[PDB]
Amino acid sequence: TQEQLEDARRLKAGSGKIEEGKLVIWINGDKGYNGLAEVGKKFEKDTGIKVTVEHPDKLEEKFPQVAATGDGPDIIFWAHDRFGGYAQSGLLAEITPDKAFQDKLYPFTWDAVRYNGKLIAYPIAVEALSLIYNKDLLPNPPKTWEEIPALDKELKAKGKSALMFNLQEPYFTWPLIAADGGYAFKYENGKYDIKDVGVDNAGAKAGLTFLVDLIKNKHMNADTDYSIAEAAFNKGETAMTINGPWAWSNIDTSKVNYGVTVLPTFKGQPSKPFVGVLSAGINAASPNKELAKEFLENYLLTDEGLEAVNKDKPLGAVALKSYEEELAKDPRIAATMENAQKGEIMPNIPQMSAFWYAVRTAVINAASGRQTVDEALKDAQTN
Ligand SMILES: OC[C@H]1O[C@H](O[C@H]2[C@H](O)[C@@H](O)[C@@H](O)O[C@@H]2CO)[C@H](O)[C@@H](O)[C@@H]1O
């Protein structure tokens, strides 16, 4: 091995290398990490406790690797779906808010961070993809996926395109795949059936086939990723994109007169985005669990704390009732919640990591022509 060898060092160098008396926080690079750092500076100014916010690449993969050895950040930020796996591996602490604090957040946000009956993270905000469109190029967005080919033909004649979004992450293609019947794991009798995966059915096939056909007919490019799509939309080159609340800040900066709205239907069915709750978990190896709790409950999850993050990159519909009442006025938030209602909240089971990896490969291989749609989804279904 070169993992059982550090089983020997971790005791000799006993025990744990997370620095006591400060907080290290990891959050994804597309989120308001500068705004979160402002909340951390307020904490430091009040309490003397230094807070360092980091946004490493692939943190959702690095965290279980480093936390398994007792290293990593004190606090990890990510959508709730990854947290059941972390908790199953013993990497997350059970969190302990009194009832007065729990009443400050929406009951459904607490449910996303409950694993085997216990709370394993603090919920921050509800994320759902919406259709984002350029009102100057497209005063009225398409109601259906099916009319997008004809729209692209029209826009292509003008050196524009209809739609670009990140084809590299299955998160972004899922709303179309799920629209006519795709699902991850079938939930029944109080639990997810890990042997009942729904990525190989007729509905999932129809959705992915529609996407592949878009690419075959030159209405999309298989290599489009997050940065390519964001640049194209914000430069005014494409009429539509698909993204979450965090993206609105850069569009504000851009020249673009944009709207946020319901995703198009497919075969008459609503697109069904998987809904994420951005959540903050506490590293089980952290010597700073009480510090982490004080920071999360009394500094971040306040009107002032969430505002600071939100002003950097919008959080979506926040879990904190008092602040959401102010944000609910925003039509972009209304659209987010409309898409969220039509979708469904992600599972947090340990199998989600394998699921996302399977679907990622399936979409990329089908989109690039390395596999047929049937072949790709059959593979993703198995196991
Ligand atoms: O694409 C698979 C990916 O989907 C979700 O990741 C989202 C995340 O929830 C959003 O907050 C935002 O950062 O975009 C990500 C997609 O690039 C799942 O949460 C994640 O576990 C999964 O791998």
Curated annotation (Swiss-Prot):
Pfam families assigned to the protein according to its UniProt record, in alphabetical order: SBP_bac_1
GO cellular component, one term: ATP-binding cassette (ABC) transporter complex, substrate-binding subunit-containing
GO biological process, one term: detection of maltose stimulus
Gene Ontology MF annotations: carbohydrate transmembrane transporter activity; maltose binding
Locations listed in the record: Periplasm
Induction description: Induced by maltose and the transcriptional regulator MalT. Permanently repressed by cold shock in a PNPase-dependent fashion.
Principal location listed in the UniProt entry: periplasm
Keywords annotated in UniProt: Periplasm, Signal, Sugar transport, Transport
Top-rank lineage group of the source organism: Bacteria
InterPro entries for this protein: Maltose/Cyclodextrin-bd, SBP, SBP_1_CS
CDD domains associated with the record: PBP2_MBP
UniProt entry tagged with the keyword RNA-binding: no
SUPFAM superfamilies on file: Periplasmic binding protein-like II (SSF53850)
Quaternary assembly: The complex is composed of two ATP-binding proteins (MalK), two transmembrane proteins (MalG and MalF) and a solute-binding protein (MalE).
Family membership: Belongs to the bacterial solute-binding protein 1 family.
Role, per record: Part of the ABC transporter complex MalEFGK involved in maltose/maltodextrin import. Binds maltose and higher maltodextrins such as maltotriose.
Protein name per its UniProtKB record: Maltose/maltodextrin-binding periplasmic protein
